[PDB]
Design a protein around this ligand. Sequence first.
Ligand code: HEM
Length: 396
Amino acid sequence: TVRNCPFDYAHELEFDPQLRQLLTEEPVSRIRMAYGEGEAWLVTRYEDVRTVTTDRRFSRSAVLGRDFPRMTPEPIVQAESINLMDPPASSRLRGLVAKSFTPRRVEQMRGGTQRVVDRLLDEMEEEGSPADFVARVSAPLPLITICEALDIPEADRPWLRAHAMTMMNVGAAGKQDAVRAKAELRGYFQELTADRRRSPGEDLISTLATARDGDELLDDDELAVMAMVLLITGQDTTTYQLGNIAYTLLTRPDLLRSLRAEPQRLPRTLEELLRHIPFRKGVGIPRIALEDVELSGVLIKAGDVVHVSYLTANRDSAKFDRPDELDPDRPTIPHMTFGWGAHHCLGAPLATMELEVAFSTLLTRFPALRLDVPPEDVSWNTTSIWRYPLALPVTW
Ligand code: HEM
């Protein structure tokens, strides 16, 4: 009755078979995952999952305090984080960083992102073919950008990601690691944010720390946590989707030619890769059903833990015809790669912009770009809630 879900599948970017089976055959299923007390529902259908993310009957505020079935021994979340608030209390702090990424603002920052990318490739060319696209592009760019954004000193950055990542370990014994790593992170911002509030720079932490509706909207905890949360998120998913997309383009010659034939297809192609590419293992933060809510003919009692799978949502044949096929031409329908509902991804805008400025430069600069080894020789991360390539040797 209750499925085992270690969610350990890692083979290339192949869609987790357990997930494909639960989509087609038990689109609402009882499950139990690596760590946490109790069990939880798993909703896998587009429309059903859309329901769960938006319908005020399901709270993420209600998760505060539960040993919720999750994939990391220590939960990645914190108390005062945007992740454990719903609208309305979310909408005020979301509201504030959302100013920072209006298309005017993000289509300004482009300028600098173009100069970062250019320099990163002006360096990879200098060290000469072959090279690691992960080391020389996919890893640095997202980290530079979010640090530039937050005015993070150059010396702290390699440190800060090697803590960000440590919190994303699914490893039983890397839990003390995680709780210390997390608290050291909290602390560093606790201070460096209280150092902006104090002598506001003209960066983004300053934008958060200085905004005042009469009396500063953000409390110090509320801020330090928001500056800490913006750093973590600004440098995992994006670094990974830069490797994932690269791999996919260098292993689907038809796709990669089509783009080289008509580069204008790129913003449409990226959406379709985004949809497809299963850019994580398992399921992230759940929600609690606040009241009984039947959902695909299955009552969910009040106080039950609900997970949604964004990855099965994207591959729902009810929404996308030939869903497993990767058609950048297909009738555009909103993907759920960037989340949905209240907690939809806050940095969608900026990762959009990084992915556009990256692959559009790559494509022109290195038309000849090819994977330098066979695809099955590429090693895929196993230790993370995310899926990404460890290295991506390329020629040009
Ligand atoms: C390809 C790039 C990215 C992907 C695929 C991605 C994906 C996601 C996803 C799937 C969620 C799901 C939250 C949920 O539904 O429960 C999320 C939340 C979030 N992402 Fe991202 N993200 C990306 C880039 C970024 C960037 C650059 C930032 C930069 C600040 C960012 C900040 C956030 C934040 C703050 C949340 C939490 C919002 C909330 O729960 O209220 N993301 N992201």
